[PDB]
Symmetry: C5
Subunit: 387 residues, 5 copies
């Protein structure tokens, strides 16, 4: 008769049972050609170690029962038929820890030689072993283990759909300008066998991904070096004035809550510390020895009516280190008492002058070393950033 | 017989198979007319670069098998029939990264000439390439790539349902008073072809959206200019009194945690910085040079029993810059000693008077430049806000 | 026969097709009586402008095909039959932006005259145009636009199920003690027509809801007035002592982070500011002029070895404003020098006495105005709270 | 024949329609015996007033159509059959505001006398009227209103499955060591009737639950009493030294952000305040009067070159309150001037001695009252904690 | 005939009803062999006491109806058939408080002897009784109670699938480098019976899990010991200088907000406190007695024109404790007055010298004990960390 191609659609699917594996010879395995286009990196959760991606996915297999001849069917080559009306392999991921809601595709492509072509996009929220060691400059290596969850090698076998170098190089459409940058998707086929004489069909896909170290530059180093340049200005404040600790203590307090707020950036991975704590606790310790310097010089110079400067450390500091850094009436018994009391204040003032004198030279010399130390530390930072 | 229009409903759908593509000639493609009304901008996630919207969506195609004649069927023109009882095209979005739960519409409209009219609202949570460069004044350009996910150009072809200028101008019902303001929805048809002799039907929709710069005005500039007007009052505090750093340091501390709290407003986009950090770190650096000024003048004036003002910088500052800013008994050997000690304090007081004198003129002159600088900086801010 | 009422259940539903619209005459529209009981206000999201509620909902229509006679069926009046076995109208909401999961009711009520009674509770997460202008005292007006999403006025028409005043007054069961208090649910019927000779059936429901201004009283004004009463105690601290700025600056700092924390209470609506920022930035500015007062009086009184009080402003302040606020040997040449030096300190002390004298009267007079200002400002606050 | 019990399974369910209510006489109501085991309190949301629990639930009713005789069926007593193959009552909760995903149980128990036994666990996220008045020691009373959502008293009637005292006392398995402790689950049956001659079957279950006041003890009182014991140490700091406000102001600042952080513990219920704000703002006000004391004593003692202590308040304080708390040459005209100037400083020093003297006695006496006040306040706290 | 193995697939499943329990003799119970591979620990929620895991799960039972002979069926051994076409036991978990979305496996394995092999991975979000007593070093013991939710011991009985020691030792694939480390999964079978002559089939699985104490080391002790090493440097600051409280108070403030931020790490479990608060409030109290020391020494030394050092405590401190820590004209009547006034200042200066003298020795001696105390406290900390 002549109503449509609809005749063919009935005749093939009249008694077609979608439950039995489609082979005329049951020993011949059904080979499923797989193809991956990685569409987008949604989010990495370093805390739970689970990566969520979106994949444009494809399936190709051979159904020997629905084959027909192009002739006497009005030369039709391929036909679209509902997915839930035909046998479908159960390819999923072993790393599955959840189910992303992805649009359900109702149709598949069948040609006259019995090949079924199945396209569907899937959202996989899968667990991945992450190494966050070099936090700003990290490459990450996540496994995507494709398997039929039950079928054997004599039933279902996995092959590539095309040449494995192009899928590696495939950067066709992937959304850039995000947190992650795709380098390559490396395919690898393997026979896994958890049980003796029971091996199941596996095709590993190593997608290796690099973070873009821009958000974590500004959010980490910029206030940090800011806190450095404010303190260097602060060293110029004289210690005797009394504001010397009041500068630094509020600054150390400011650095304390600063490191506590940024503590919720680095993840709660129980593998240990990130390496950037080393690049930060050095800076933390740097302020301590600055603080240790600060109270020391305020401990030296003060008016406490105490000891005179010992000559041994006067020549070493006020002389040697200065050159190194630069390059009858009874009225008489009462008048005698007043100047005697007077010169005692003048002498303690003489004490006040010399201890103050050494301290400023000491303050300047200890100031010189710290600025040179940070600049040398800074030149190490930028040479590491360049390499 | 005469029970109802129900007769027609059976007779058409008696043997109607919803699986085969509805054409009497299989080579003639089924043309699907699409129509978009963008209903609402739900939320932009700049972090993951994914935009979620709600669309009032429509479908129009031709089913040649369910056509009938208005006569002998009691002059019925159109009939409502269940969606899951007829063939439905698989139009979805390539940018799909998730599935929004949207009400499932059970019925579609069929007229006697076989045209199927399908209305359904859909929630699309789709990834979009965002450019957040000019953060308060940004236009955003997001793609909505409509496609049949598998069908060819010889099966499914995409056309507009009406004239493409009205859908552009369509601001009919869209919810304003939100974070985003709709400018236009620009449609564009294209033939995409990832494979040779395999092209698939595509209709791009560029919806271009503008943020409303009101929430980010108050939340950014108002405390910022507030922190400016409190410091200008603070410059009037005398440096010798000792409170001079205590004002500014707490203020700089206050500005430090202020910028850390607002750091979680700007997103974690790894494309680099927003431009508003330039409009902010300038203000940040402005306080530094204020702080640098502050400790400098406190370094100048202090009572440390040291050097007298050099005349070369006395004429340049206390004289030139002042005019520029304004426009036999042995009792004698003891009495000789007391005034000698006395005038030493008076002389260091003479030292205390002159160094204090220059500093206040210096404080006032350096004060004049900063207020003029901020006001000039402010007049640049408002002229940019007007343009 | 006599097995049960089950006979009737078969006989009616034997050939009953749930797909065709149930009318013997196709031109007669099926009228759907709607009824609303608003059960609870779950949450308002001012950010995205979307209101989520729970409704106890009802449907009433006429199915002319399943009518029967009470006689010869053992006098049965009504019968419960599965929802998915009969035709159901598609009434939904145009404001739908999402789908709340609500229990699916499997059965409906059918009486012998063919009326189908459908009860089901639904969770609607719908977008609503909000006006948060008067933030503590706001009434909100949200639309619930009920429509058949496709059917015409000749097929489906919407009526009330009972008198529209009772549903307005309906406060039967609604959960109080929550964030929102139900005033009324105002129904309104309208014919909307987006297209010429194509109008679709609409029944608007304006539910108008009021917030309960109790959580936002304590969370806003109580620490705010607290910060006021601590500063009034602080004005009594003498400015010369040096602690004068140290009080207020920490207090201004405390007020700075206070306003930053409460900044995440008011929503990110891009319609502009809430009005309560006016009721807050006034208080913010109030501390500034207090701070401006504070440094001013500390700028007046200090020991800087400078100018004497000018008489013109001495009579205006120390005299006029005080009454307004209250209501041969050569030993002689050396002894001459010591008192000469001595009286210079005594004279600068004389300078220290008078400048201090004016300042305290000045401090007290400027103190009087501010307390009267806040109390007058406070009496404005409570008279607004009463109205 | 003899294949299995499968014969019975067919014979009963051959023509069994799951849509019609299972009664041979339609007037006899189907009585559904209900049983509740409350398994766990998941979370209380005081903000939205909605309680989420997990219930082990049971259903018992009578199906007169599937009854059979144990004989000639190989003495089978009960049989397991799929839930979706038989009629199931629609018992749900009126307080339903959402749907928790709970495992779907596929089978039910049928015995030969036609009784259907239905077990299924359900997750109910239901709205509950909460009273958070006594925040640490609260009992909460939540309603669980079980109803058939449509069926009448002549169709479905609700009874207990066993004696109502055991379900009350039922603490069998419930998970302790959580935020909530189960006291009892009180059942109550009632006929509700919203409409005249239309009453629907209701069985109320009052589960009354108590919080465990341990997390909120440490998180509230421990830092609070800590802030008390640090201030009592702070009162010993002398006011003249200048650090007196600097202690307390930072402490008051610390208490200010402390109360702001703990402000997000108490919920946003619009019923008013919790009672614990009274137990906290008293402590808040306690520091104010301490602060008021602090600036007062610093206002008393200072060196401002002003008034002498009035005798009336010298006897009342330095005398009475002290005992209460404890239990020819012209050289002469110049020499005359110097001591005259000298004794003026000594006299103002005499002023400095006496005003300082009264203040410390005043500081100690005002110190005594505050420590006794807090200890008395503390003894009130612990006697309330014991009762 | 010879089309395929498809013949067998029909012949077995032609009249196979998936609703009746598959036994030829109804008294013989169907034994379900269970097997567990625990795949990953997703997240522990100590707040609600609910553990979420992912399990690779297996089912094994015997279907006596679908048995066949390998001969005359082309020697086929096993066959894959759809899950929803055969009877499936209802094994779930009693601890279920929610439903995780896990991929639905469509097929199961049937061999010719009638054994059905069911593989499926499941996500179980289940409530677990947690003991967080030793917070960094905790072992946790969670129950996984596997049961058929309704079937009796005469219908369904639970056995292991293999030897119970290997499943215990099974560390095959589990994802390490996470928050939790798998020690063992201990299986145990038990007959539970809530009702007399009604016992239901139970197999308990105790998985015992250990946290990895690395994230909570750095996040707790590192800033804490940091706050210790900054204070020890702070003790060297002299108390007379006035900065003595200003150091510690800001530090105590810094420690106050530090403990408030880390307060949201420990959970809100109402079982009481964690033990680590003891290891922290000791450190908290340590700063108090440091603060108590700080104000004490500032209370001792000050210039208040008061009492002389009593000899009894001078020998005990300045002598004994110092050695323990180290190892005619009328001009005369006026001149008489000036030195008399002069020596009064010198004498109060003599008072200023001695009280200052004792305090520094006192400051140093009290300094020695605290450093030894923390180091002894520290050596207790590290010996506990080693054990
Ligand atoms: C319209 N869509 C466009 C083109 C057809 C449809 C589905 C998408 O393509 C793929 O399916 C492929 C992904 N990766 C592949 C690799 C080899 C062949 C096809 C694809 C993008
Ligand atoms: C009741 N609803 C009202 C009117 C009918 C129903 C569905 C909505 O309209 C649309 O479907 C359209 C959206 N965009 C369009 C463009 C051209 C024609 C129709 C629509 C709003
Ligand atoms: C047990 N439930 C109780 C009473 C029957 C069942 C369903 C609920 O009532 C409604 O359906 C109505 C809501 N609003 C209405 C308005 C008019 C008539 C009925 C209702 C509450
Ligand atoms: C294995 N599970 C165990 C025992 C059977 C199965 C289901 C649960 O028990 C219940 O269903 C009951 C709850 N509450 C009840 C009250 C009276 C009778 C039974 C139950 C726990
Ligand atoms: C491909 N997948 C690989 C191997 C087959 C498929 C399913 C997984 O294995 C299991 O099902 C088992 C888990 N635990 C077990 C214990 C004994 C036997 C099998 C398993 C991993």
């Amino acid at each position: 008769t002549q109503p449509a191609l609809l005749r063919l659609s009935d005749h093939l699917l009249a008694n077609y049972k979608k439950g039995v594996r489609p082979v005329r010879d049951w020993r011949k395995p059904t080979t499923v050609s797989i193809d991956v286009i990685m569409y987008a990196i949604l989010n990495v959760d370093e805390k739970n170690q689970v990566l969520t991606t979106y994949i444009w996915y494809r399936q190709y297999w051979t159904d020997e029962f629905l084959q027909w001849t192009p002739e006497d069917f009005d030369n039709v080559t391929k036909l679209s038929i509902p997915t839930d009306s035909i046998w479908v392999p159960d390819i999923l991921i072993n790393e599955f820890v959840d189910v992303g809601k992805s649009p359900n595709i109702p149709y598949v492509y069948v040609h006259h030689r019995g090949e079924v072509q199945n396209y569907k996009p899937l959202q996989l929220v899968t667990a991945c072993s992450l190494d966050i060691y070099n936090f700003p400059f990290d490459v990450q290596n996540c496994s995507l283990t494709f398997t039929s969850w039950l079928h054997t090698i004599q039933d279902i076998n996995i092959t590539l759909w095309r040449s494995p170098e192009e899928v590696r190089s495939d950067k066709s459409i992937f959304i850039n300008q995000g947190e992650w940058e795709l380098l390559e998707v490396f395919p690898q086929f393997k026979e896994f066998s958890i049980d003796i004489s029971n091996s199941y069909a596996e095709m590993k896909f190593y997608v290796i991904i690099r973070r873009r170290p821009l958000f974590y530059a500004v959010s980490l180093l910029l206030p940090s070096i800011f806190l450095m340049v404010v303190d260097i200005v602060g060293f110029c404040l004289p210690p005797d004035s009394g504001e010397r600790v009041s500068f630094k203590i509020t600054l150390l307090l400011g650095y304390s809550v600063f490191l506590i707020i940024v503590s919720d950036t680095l993840p709660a991975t129980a593998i240990g510390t990130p390496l950037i704590g080393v690049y930060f606790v050095v800076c933390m310790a740097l302020l301590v020895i600055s603080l240790a310097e600060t109270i020391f010089i305020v401990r030296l110079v003060h008016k406490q009516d105490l000891q005179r400067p010992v000559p041994d450390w006067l020549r070493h500091l006020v002389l040697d280190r200065i050159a190194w850094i630069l390059c009858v009436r009874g009225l008489l018994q009462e008048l005698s008492s007043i100047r005697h009391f007077l010169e005692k204040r003048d002498e303690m003032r003489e004490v006040a002058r010399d201890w103050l004198r050494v301290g400023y030279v000491l303050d300047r010399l200890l100031f010189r070393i710290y600025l040179l130390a940070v600049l040398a530390y800074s030149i190490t930072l930028v040479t590491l950033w360049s390499i």
